[PDB]
Each structure stands twice: as C-alpha cells, then as structure tokens.
Design a protein around this nucleic acid. Structure first.
Lengths: 95, 83, 75, 97, 109, 109, 95, 83, 97
DNA sequence: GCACTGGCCGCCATACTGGAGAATCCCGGTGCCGAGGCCGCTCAATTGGTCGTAGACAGCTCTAGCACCGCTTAAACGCACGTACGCGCTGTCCCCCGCGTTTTAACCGCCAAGGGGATTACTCCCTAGTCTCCAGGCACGTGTCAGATATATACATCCTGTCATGTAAGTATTAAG
DNA sequence: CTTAATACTTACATGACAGGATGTATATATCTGACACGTGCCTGGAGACTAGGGAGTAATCCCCTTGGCGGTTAAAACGCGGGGGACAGCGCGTACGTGCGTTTAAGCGGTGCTAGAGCTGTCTACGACCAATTGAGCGGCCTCGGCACCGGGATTCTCCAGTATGGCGGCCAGTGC
C-alpha cells in the first residue's frame, strides 16, 4: 500500500519525445525537471498573485500571467512565451 | 518632442559628487562614460518593469508605487514611498 | 658617524663579484649585514648609486637608475 | 601668493561634506529629461508623477553609491586609490549582474 | 446522456496539464478566483520553456554522443544561454559542475 | 445587552492593531484560515522592532541635538545595529545617505 | 470628500511616545516607518504562508510565524521578539 | 556519540579539489582555515534554518525537502531533491 | 632521472579533470560527521536522511565553487595568480555577507 | 723638503616647527511652515452565536537510519626539493584634482490648460461549487541495452637534450703622443 | 717607450628543434541495473448548471501633471598647473606544487534494531461568516516653535617660511718617506 506523489514525468517525457524522439533521460535529470517546473510555476504564480494584490484584483487571468512573463523572463524568451501562450489560448478559445 | 542624448545631462561633477559620497578619493577619466552605461542599464531594467506594471494597470501615467514595486522585484527595495 | 657609504658600496660589489652585477636589494642586505641604518637612508643610497654610476667606478648590468644590478668597472 | 590646498585633502573634504549630508546629488530636471527619453522607447507619451521621478532618482543614486563603495573596496584591494573601469566590471561580476 | 470527456490540454493542443496547473493555483493560495485562460497560458509558457531547455539538453547530449541526458548536460545547456543564465543565475544543479572555463592569465605563455 | 466594546490591542496590551493586522492577513491571501494568536504575536513582533528602531533614531537625534528625527537619523540608526543591518541589507532609505566611514589608506599620513 | 487611505500613523506615534515622550518625527521619517512595517509584515506573512503550505496546514497560527521570526530576525532580536510574542499571547489568553 | 572538532574533516586536498573546480591555479596555505570558517558559517545558517523547519514539523529526523526549503529561503536554490 | 612536470601544468590538469567532472568532490563520511556535529549544537539527537546530507553536499560545494570563481576574479584583478584569504573576505563583503 | 692624508671646519641639501589663512564649528537672531493637536466623520473592529471542519491525539506498521563488523585499497599526509610568485623599491611618465574665470540652464516662481486618474454606477461574463462519471498518470512489475567498466592502441604535450647563434668578454696589436 | 684604441677570437647565455614519457584520448568487449515499457487502478480531471459576484465600461471632475516665460545664479564647462598616482622592471625570498612513500580511514558489503515516518481513525477544539454597533482612527484645519536661513566670531585644519641636522666638500697641518 502506497500513497501517490504527483510529478511531471510523463509530461516532460512527452515533450522530450516531441522535440527529440531519439533522446532519453536519466532519473536524475527528471528530478531536475520536476524541481524546475515547480520552481518556475512558483515564480510566475507568486508574481501573478502579487500583481493581483497591486491592482486590488481578486482574479488571475492570462493578462496578469503574461505581465509576469514579460516581467521576469529576460529578452527574446518573453516574446516567444507570449507567442506560444497566445496561440494556445487562441485554440483554447476556439475549442 | 523627441530627445536623442540626455545621458550626458548626468554631468561629470554630479558623478564626482556621487563618488565623493561613495568614499572615492580619486576618479579616473574613463569612469564617467561607463558609469553612464551602468546607470542606463539600471534605469532600463527598472523602467521596463515599472512600465510593464503601468500599462498592466491600463494607466498611461507612471506612478511612484510602480517604481517602488519595480525595485521590490529587483531586490533593491526603497523605503519612504511605500504607499 | 663613520666613513661615507660609497666605499662600503665598493666593498659590497667586491664581496662576491658573480656573473652579473650586484643588485639593489643585495647591496641593501650587504649594508644591513655589515651594519648600517638602511631604513632612513633610502634616498641616501639612491643618490649614492646614481653618483657611482655617473663617475663610472661601477657600471650597471641590467636595470635603470638605482634598480637592477651594478658591477665593477673594467679595471 | 594665492592659497592652494594639496590634491586629495580637498577631495576628502567633499567626501565628508556629502557623506554626512542627505540631499540630492544630481540635477533634478535633466534627470527627468533622461527618464522620459529612455521611457518613451517603450511606450509613447508616458507621463510621470513628480514623486515617481523623485523615487526613481534616489533609487538610482542608491544603486550607484553602493556600486562605488564596492569599487572602492576593489580599488584598495588592488593597492590603488583611484577607481578604474575594470573595478566596475569586477564589482558588477561579483554581484552577478 | 453525457458528452465524452475531452481534456483541456488537448483542447489547447498542449502536453502540459491544464487541470493540474489550475488545481495547483487553487491550492497554491494565490487568488480567490482564477480566469479560464490563465492556467492554459501558464501551461503553454511552461511547455515552451521545458521544450527549449530539453532541446538544448538533447543537443548537448548528442554532442557528448549520449542517448540519454544527465544533469551535466542540463548544467551545460543552462549556463551557455544568456537568457536562461539570467533566468537561473541563483540556481544550483546537483552533480552539475560548471562550464569548461579558464582565465586568460592562468594559461601558460 | 452587549458588553462594552473592548479592543484586542488592549487585550494584549499592544499598540499595533490586532484587528487591522488580522484583516490584512485574511485578505493578504496567505491561508484561508488564520489562528487567533497569530495577529497578536505578529503585532508584538512589529511593536518590538519599532521599539528599538525608534529609540535608536531618537538617541541619534539627541546626539545630533534634534528633537525631531529625520531620515538621516533613521539611516544612522539602522546601519549602526549589525543585526538590523543584516535585516535590511538590501533596503534603500530615502535621503538617508551613508555612514561616515572612510578607509584607513584614504587618510593622509 | 475622499475615501479613507489606511496608514500606520497612530500606532507608530504612540510607540514613539512610549519609548521617547519628548521627541518628534518628520513625516518623511514616518513614511519610512510605514514602509518598514509593511515590508516586515510582507516578509513574515509570506514565510507563514510557505510554512502552512509545506506542512499541508490550512491555518496560520502563532507557532509558524514564531518559526518564521526565528528564521528571519538574527539572534537576540529573534529571542526577544519570541519573548514579547509569548507574553502577549498569554495576556491575550487571559483576555 | 560525542563529536568534537570534525571541521578538519573537510580535508586540505578536498579544498584543493574544490579550488581546481573553482579554477584556482595556485592556493595559499593560509587559505584553508578561513575556507573552513566560511563553509562552517554557511552550515550554521542552513542547518539552523533546516532544524527550524524540522522541529517546526515536530520531527526528530531531518529531511532533504526541508533542506530544499532552507536553500530556497537563502536564495541559493538547489535542484534534484524533490523540490 | 624520473619524470616531473613543472608547477601549474599538473594543476591545470586537475582543473580540466575536476571542472569537466561532476562527482561529489569532498569525502562523504567526514562531511556527514561534520553535519551531525554542527546540528548537535542546535537540537539534540537529530537523525538525518542520507539524501539530506547529500543535498548539503551539493549545496555546500556549489556555494564554495561560486565563492572560488569570485575569488579568482578578485585575485586576477589584483594582478595575482595566487589567492589570499583577504580575497575571500572581499568577495563575501561585496556579496553582502 | 715635499707630498699624502686624516682631521677638522665651513657650506649645502633635507627634515622639524611656528605662524598665517580659511573652512568649518559654534554662537546668536528671525521668520516660517510642517508637526501636532483638535474636530467632525465613517467604517472597520467588535461581539456573539453558529457551524462546519482541521489538525491533534492515539495507535499501528514498517522501513530506513543507525549501529556494528570485516576487508580493501584510495587517499591523507608528510616531506623534500624546486621554481615560481608576492611584493617591495624605484623611477618615470602622465593624468587627473584644485582653482580660477566664463557661461548657461536649473531653480524658482508664476501662470494657463487639459489628460487622465479616479471614483460611482450599472449590467454582465465568468467562475466556483457540486454532483456524477470515467480515463490517465501513478504504483508496480519486468526485461534489457546504454553506458560503466575493462583492456589494448595512438597521439598530445610537455619537458628536456642538443646544436646553432648572439653576445660578452678576454686578448694581441699598433699607432700616436 | 708607453698606453689606450681596435679588431679578433672564444666561452657562455639564449634559443630553435627533435624526441621520448606519459597522460589522455580512442577503439573494442561485457554485463548490468536503471531506463523504459506493459498493467491494474482510482481518483483527479471533466461536464452541466447555477448562484453569484468581480469586473468591464460609461460619465465626470478636478487635479495634478504638462506646457511655457523671466531672473539669477551656482553649477557646469574650459583651461593651467602641477603634484600625485599608477605602474613597469627587477630582484629576492619564500611558499606552495609536484612527486615519492606511508597510514589510515573512507568506502563497500553484510546483519540486525528500532524509532520514528507515515498512514488511519476521532473528535473536539476552533476559526470563519454574519448582523448590528460604536468608537477608534482618519480627513481636514490652524497655530507655533523647532528649525531653516542668515549673520558674526573661534577653532582647528592646511600649507608654507623659517630653523636644526646630516652629509658633502675643502683646507690644513702632521708625519713619513
């Protein structure tokens, strides 16, 4: 009898096989990716909450998260992450 | 309307006064332009942040609290205008 | 009081006479070992070295002025 | 003869003078001009509270002045008393900028 | 009687979990309400960032002619990209090492 | 037939408001539930910290023969206490200046 | 008129009058006290939220902010602030 | 069970190996004791933080997850240990 | 006569070897002992997860290596190829520690 | 008698010391505007009861840290010699502070105007909750090849021997006084 | 006859190049457990619907920001001087670097214990929600005195003109030849 602990093993593995069908991982690198996804999610979510604090807003929408993305992410990665997020919310709205 | 060079408006005696506050006895001649570079980098970083808050608020006026938050993100928190 | 420093510098350069000239730190150590207040006579020993190189009694091997190595004349 | 103090002791006197003092060290309105011209490169016709330009001012000389005691430590560390640009990249890189 | 279940990540055409990220935002104590596009956008950003770093890691492992990535590859990828370096300047990777990096005066001649 | 409206700051004998700090913790989005002793403990901590920094500012003002404390007094007080200076190592005081402290080699012979 | 802007005037002023009845403040210094109290409140509240998060606790109690103030404040500041916090909470349990 | 002066357990060649990873071409012999002191001071920082988490959790066993919190709270974030 | 390299060439060889390599660089057991010894001072009878002491090992080596490249920057800035503890004090105090 | 030479005295370069200038400290005077205290207001803390639920306590389990023990070498250590580096002195060059004069735009201050922040109101877009239901990743089992490890070649590099060469130094010659 | 100029010739430092040693790549065998894939599952994700509410958006207003004109002056700018700082060369002394043996204690493999980590059940304390209240805190106003601004004398801090000291030079007289 065990209790489940949630992680991103299949998700990172799927994204890797999308970008590299022929490349594997170690378990250690997967632990690094789990720490990374949790850390970056933590940073974006904290800054989004702090922005919602600043504008006295109780709602988090994609505008605030996109604001945090331009705020924290340096350089061209900002324009990129806005690009895929905008395309993704475009399909999500059209679905 | 348009401005092309105001970074030379931070005068050499002003930089000298800043270094005198820093305890600097002697300032090389090559100091001033790279201090202009580091200050335009710092101002660049803080106003990109503060402006990002500024049209995040749907407002066209830069407020002091925005500069406070921009420094608070950037690890260089300022006391005196909190609120 | 005692004698002036210059002849003691001649004994310093004649003490070893190795392949290169005797150096500034070596002559300071030689005067300290023979017994002299080299601490308060740095300007004195600089002017002494310049005086002796100007008269040609000793010639300088590598350095310039009071630095580097000093060696005795040809004869 | 006209009187003249030797170099540096005047400079130490301004060190003491501005170091006990509290006021602004740079001109206000050229700073406002610089802030507006560098700001308009992101969003056009930005308007600034006077308090906002003020805040951005003391934040600016705060970061600059901290950089100068850091480069002061760099300068004495290299057995020198005049700061040099290489002291600046040293301080910037040790801070991890 | 009931529509067949469709996942929101597949609706967005994304691998990253819309539902799990949304649920984490509910229990990460960040806001009372969360808009619908916010977790989708966050999932897209995370998926892009992970895709980019995994692409760099796979390229580095291919340069090391290794089929599987190791945290040394992650270190090598994360340090030689300036935007990623500025993203993760203060982050330390276990068993990662540092870049092959010698100073100029340290070399002979 | 309600009893007299008494205050929790008077209940703890403290000056900082238990009610306002409790309200800020409720709407600062840190947890959905907050135990009752937490705002009391927090207000006590804030009052203690203000206690030293205010008395040190007043002492430095009395050294400067001022009965009205100035931000210069605050900077002088905060940089002269090493633990508080560690507490505010990254913090900028407006119009505060720096300590009078020059390196030994900067002075003449 | 104007909507009320909440501030920390009265409490810091009364603390001053207890520690030094005779002296005064500038309003600029008083704003620095407002910023100080806000910043320390944010630090302690964020750490309390993290500790409630980490131990899967739904509550903010005196124990975890006690943990936080032991983390942040150095040395005898931490020990004393513990002391006034404990005597204050015991007085509050005595109502 | 009693432990006395295990600071010298961080051996001198271990410090030399770290300096080789640190890119140090030549090390003074005076370096080692202050490196021990610096790493020591860092350890009381992180272990005090970790135990503050630990008997915050009322546990007698120190976990790696609490160490991850201690390093994150120090701004020295570590990856690969369940965080 | 046996082989002998000139100084530094071997040293650069450990630089390449260890900076290429990724393993834990200090001994495991005395580091475990030192963690136990320090932790005994703050709380009695502490037990440690082995993974926790490992996490301390990478955290400590990362912190130390970062300080050592900072020290190298300081030493080359002072025109030296040999570091002194004053370099480390400089790097710590510029870092704000 | 004469020339060498040591000793002694006179003169010059270099390090103490008092005195003048002046920057700032220290003392009054004055007028003022921010602190501070009072007054009216309003909204937020309070109080009390309910109600649902969060973690504290107990208890059980099992597992991973701890303790102990025996080989088994890798590494710690120590020493010794060597060479390479830190630093100190000096000299040299040149670069930046101090100070004086000229200029300009910053500051104030004074007025005009309008952009937008900000506040209120309204109506609505959206989201959270709840019930039900199902498929996706998680726990877990298994097998299996990428890589760790081991063994044999081949170059890199790096230190050194070895021969050619520049250069310093010793030397005969000789020409002129 | 003498003695310094000058060419001539040789040993030593320096440098260019070959070559071996050795460490590090580089090519091939092998086994293995960690990665990867197959399986039960159940619970976290999803769908519908609805209550409700934050928030988007229009109106306005006033206020705070922006625009512009005149004076004035202190600060910015330019130039001379010069003294002070940087720094390069060299040289010494030492202090680690590297290379040998040696001790040892980490490392690894194996056994056994248990203390506590963690899961499960209970429930009981306990904290959120909400209606009504009121008084504590905040907007607003108005005075005054601590303090900014200003003026005048002392004191201390700075730098230089003048003195005391050490070293250099010159002269003379004693003495030996």
């Amino acid at each position: 009898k065990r209790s489940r602990k949630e992680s991103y093993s299949v998700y990172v593995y799927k994204v890797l096989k999308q970008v590299h069908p022929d490349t594997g991982i170690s378990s250690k690198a997967m632990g690094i990716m789990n720490s990374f996804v949790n850390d970056i999610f933590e940073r974006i979510a904290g800054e989004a909450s702090r922005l919602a604090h600043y504008n006295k807003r109780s709602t988090i929408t994609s505008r605030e998260i996109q604001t945090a993305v331009r705020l924290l992410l340096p350089g061209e990665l900002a324009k990129h992450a806005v690009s895929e997020g905008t395309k993704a919310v475009t399909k999500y709205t059209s679905a | 309307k348009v401005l092309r060079d105001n970074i030379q408006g931070i005068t050499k005696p002003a930089i000298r006064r800043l270094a005198r506050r820093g305890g600097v006895k002697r300032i090389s001649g090559l100091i001033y332009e790279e201090t202009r570079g580091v200050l335009k980098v710092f101002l660049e970083n803080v106003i990109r942040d503060a402006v990002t808050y500024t049209e995040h608020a749907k407002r066209k006026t830069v407020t002091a609290m925005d500069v406070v938050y921009a420094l608070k993100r950037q690890g260089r928190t300022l006391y005196g205008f909190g609120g | 009081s005692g004698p002036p420093v210059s002849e003691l510098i001649t004994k310093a350069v004649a003490a070893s006479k190795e392949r290169s000239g005797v150096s500034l730190a070596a002559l300071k150590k030689a005067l300290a070992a023979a017994g002299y207040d080299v601490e308060k006579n740095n300007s004195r020993i600089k002017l002494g070295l310049k005086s002796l190189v100007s008269k040609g009694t000793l010639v300088q091997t590598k350095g310039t002025g009071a630095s580097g190595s000093f060696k005795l004349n040809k004869k | 003869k006209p009187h003249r103090y030797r170099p540096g002791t005047v400079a130490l006197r301004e060190i003491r003078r501005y170091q006990k003092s509290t006021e602004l060290l740079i001109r206000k309105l050229p700073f406002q001009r610089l802030v507006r011209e560098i700001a308009q490169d992101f969003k056009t016709d930005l308007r600034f509270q006077s308090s906002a330009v003020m805040a951005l001012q003391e934040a600016s000389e705060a970061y600059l002045v901290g950089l100068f005691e850091d480069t002061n430590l760099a300068a004495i560390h290299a057995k020198r008393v005049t700061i040099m640009p290489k002291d600046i990249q040293l301080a910037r890189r040790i801070r991890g900028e | 009687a009931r529509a067949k279940a469709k996942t929101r990540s597949s609706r967005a055409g994304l691998q990253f979990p819309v539902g799990r990220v949304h649920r984490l935002l509910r229990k990460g104590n960040y806001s009372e309400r969360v808009g619908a596009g916010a977790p989708v956008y966050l999932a897209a950003v995370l998926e892009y960032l992970t895709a980019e770093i995994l692409e760099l890691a796979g390229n580095a492992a291919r340069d090391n002619k290794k089929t599987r990535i190791i945290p040394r590859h992650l270190q090598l990828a994360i340090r030689n990209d300036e935007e990623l370096n500025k993203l993760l300047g203060r982050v330390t990777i276990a068993q990662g090492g540092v870049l092959p990096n010698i100073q100029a005066v340290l070399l002979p001649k």
